[PDB]
């Protein structure tokens, strides 16, 4: 399972969720899979996907929100989990796409997520028929991927903002 497969898996599990994708291969992959108006792509600011997602889940506590981190973006701003685990947003899904073979390894991420207050944390190594996820977050999904392309994302950041927030506004209060 590569990152392509893992992102398709996450999309199939949370079809209606708002996605905040960390910058790099993860955002480009997600865009190429299915560029939905509910995908908020990061062009840079490695380490900010999870804070932005936490703010979003604060303002909109009832809507499902998936943050797509890599091992790098996760480790760069690890402290964010302390706030996520303290605020405890109930519809927050922290996905960590981890392609560790050279680097600081990502170890015991699910245990640590549980330690700081996450409601659940699971690990996925291969494509499974199903996995039952507790409907109440915050939940961490650690997915081990093996890297293997894709058109560069053709939306200006302002257009991303407008599409994403328009979707958010119209599918809740209005």
């Amino acid at each position: 399972m590569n990152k392509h497969d893992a992102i398709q898996l996450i999309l199939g599990q949370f079809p209606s969720a708002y996605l905040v994708s960390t910058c790099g291969h993860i955002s480009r992959d997600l865009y190429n899979i299915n560029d939905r108006a509910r995908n908020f792509y990061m062009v840079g600011s490695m380490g900010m996907a999870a804070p932005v997602g936490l703010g979003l889940s604060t303002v909109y506590p009832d809507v499902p929100l998936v943050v797509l981190d890599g091992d790098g973006s996760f480790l760069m701003n690890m402290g964010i989990i302390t706030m996520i685990g303290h605020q405890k947003p109930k519809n927050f899904i922290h996905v960590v796409l981890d392609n560790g073979m050279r680097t600081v390894p990502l170890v015991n991420v699910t245990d640590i997520a549980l330690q700081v207050g996450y409601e659940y944390a699971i690990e996925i190594n291969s494509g499974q028929k199903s996995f039952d996820l507790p409907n109440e977050g915050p939940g961490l999904i650690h997915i081990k991927v093996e890297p293997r392309i894709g058109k560069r994302v053709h939306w200006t950041p302002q257009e991303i903002v407008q599409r994403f927030t328009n979707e958010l506004t119209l599918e809740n209060e209005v």
Partner: protein, 142 residues
Amino acid sequence: STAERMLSTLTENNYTHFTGVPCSLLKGFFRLLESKQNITFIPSIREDSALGVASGMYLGGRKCVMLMQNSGLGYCLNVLTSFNFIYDIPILLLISGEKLTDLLDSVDIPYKELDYENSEGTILDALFLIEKTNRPVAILIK
């Protein structure tokens, strides 16, 4: 006092959301934010995370401001230059001199100096500029 006078204007201009790191210099405003009127305050471990949380709140259609100090500005810099000035996500920064504004204008973030007897003319100048810019503008303090 000076604290409440600020908060009231912001809270009735729809600014009811605030992030920041607890710290001695602006202790009174953290005091009031956790004193009480409905306000949502998110304590943050570091300034860059506070900026990210504020930006996400803004994306949730919520106007918000982040309290900070000069020393933290470095941490936010890239974010401000690579995210909010690229996505046009306005956040009010009440940053609490020469070096500071030299750096700011070298990387191009509008700033103003608050005078304490005339609280609102600085903050409303800043609010107007963020309305014109849809970009963060800084309000400076001692």
